[PDB]
């Protein structure tokens, strides 16, 4: 993947995450902040989910209370480079677990 393609895809992913988290209307209070380009989602129990870009590798990284996951773009989808699971499935699973409420953007 070229650098420009990564900027394009990551920018689009950032917008989608920001909009989805801003349009959150569930019962739980979920906060999303962008600092130094890094997205941090904070839940009521104090836990967090962090999303950042790894420019050199053209990857998006996810850190949750449970673990860490690195993603490559494959078939128009961000895929975990160890399990093949999608970024949205992993983010939603973690957010749901950490919020204690369904966090789905399907």
From Swiss-Prot:
Effect on the protein of changing residue 18 to K: Abolishes iron binding and increases kinetics of Fe-S formation on IscU
Regulation of activity: Binds iron under oxidative stress conditions, but not under conditions emulating the intracellular redox potential.
Record annotation: effect of changing residue 61 to R: Increases kinetics of Fe-S formation on IscU
Any one GO molecular function term: ferric iron binding
A Gene Ontology cellular-component term: cytoplasm
Effect of inactivating the gene: Cells are not affected in cellular iron content and sensitivity to oxidants.
Result after altering residue 19 to K: Abolishes iron binding and increases kinetics of Fe-S formation on IscU
InterPro entries recorded: CyaY (IPR047584), Frataxin/CyaY (IPR002908), Frataxin/CyaY_sf (IPR036524), Frataxin_CS (IPR020895)
Alphabetical keyword list: Iron, Metal-binding
GO BP, sorted A to Z: iron-sulfur cluster assembly
Entry-linked CDD domains: Frataxin (cd00503)
PANTHER family: FRATAXIN, FRATAXIN, MITOCHONDRIAL
HAMAP family attached to this UniProt entry: CyaY
Physiological role: Involved in iron-sulfur (Fe-S) cluster assembly. May act as a regulator of Fe-S biogenesis. Can bind both Fe(2+) and Fe(3+) ions. In vivo, has a positive effect on Fe-S cluster biogenesis under iron-rich growth conditions. In vitro, can inhibit IscS cysteine desulfurase activity and the formation of Fe-S clusters on IscU. In vitro, in the presence of IscS and cysteine, Fe(3+)-CyaY can be used as an iron donor during Fe-S cluster assembly on the scaffold protein IscU.
Quaternary structure and partners: Monomer. Forms homodimers and higher oligomers in the presence of iron. Interacts with IscS.
Record family assignment: Belongs to the frataxin family.
Name of the protein in question: Iron-sulfur cluster assembly protein CyaY
The species this protein was found in: Escherichia coli (strain K12)
Designated gene of the protein: cyaY
């Amino acid at each position: 993947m070229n650098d420009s393609e990564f900027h394009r895809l990551a920018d689009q992913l950032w917008l989608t995450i920001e909009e989805r988290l801003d349009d959150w209307d569930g019962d739980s209070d979920i906060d999303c902040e962008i600092n130094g380009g890094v997205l941090t989602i904070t839940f009521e129990n104090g836990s967090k989910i962090i999303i950042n870009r790894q420019e050199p590798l053209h990857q998006v990284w996810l850190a949750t209370k449970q673990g860490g996951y690195h993603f490559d773009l494959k078939g128009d989808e961000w895929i975990c480079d160890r399990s093949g699971e999608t970024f949205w499935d992993l983010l939603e699973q973690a957010a749901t677990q950490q919020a204690g409420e369904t966090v789905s953007f399907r």
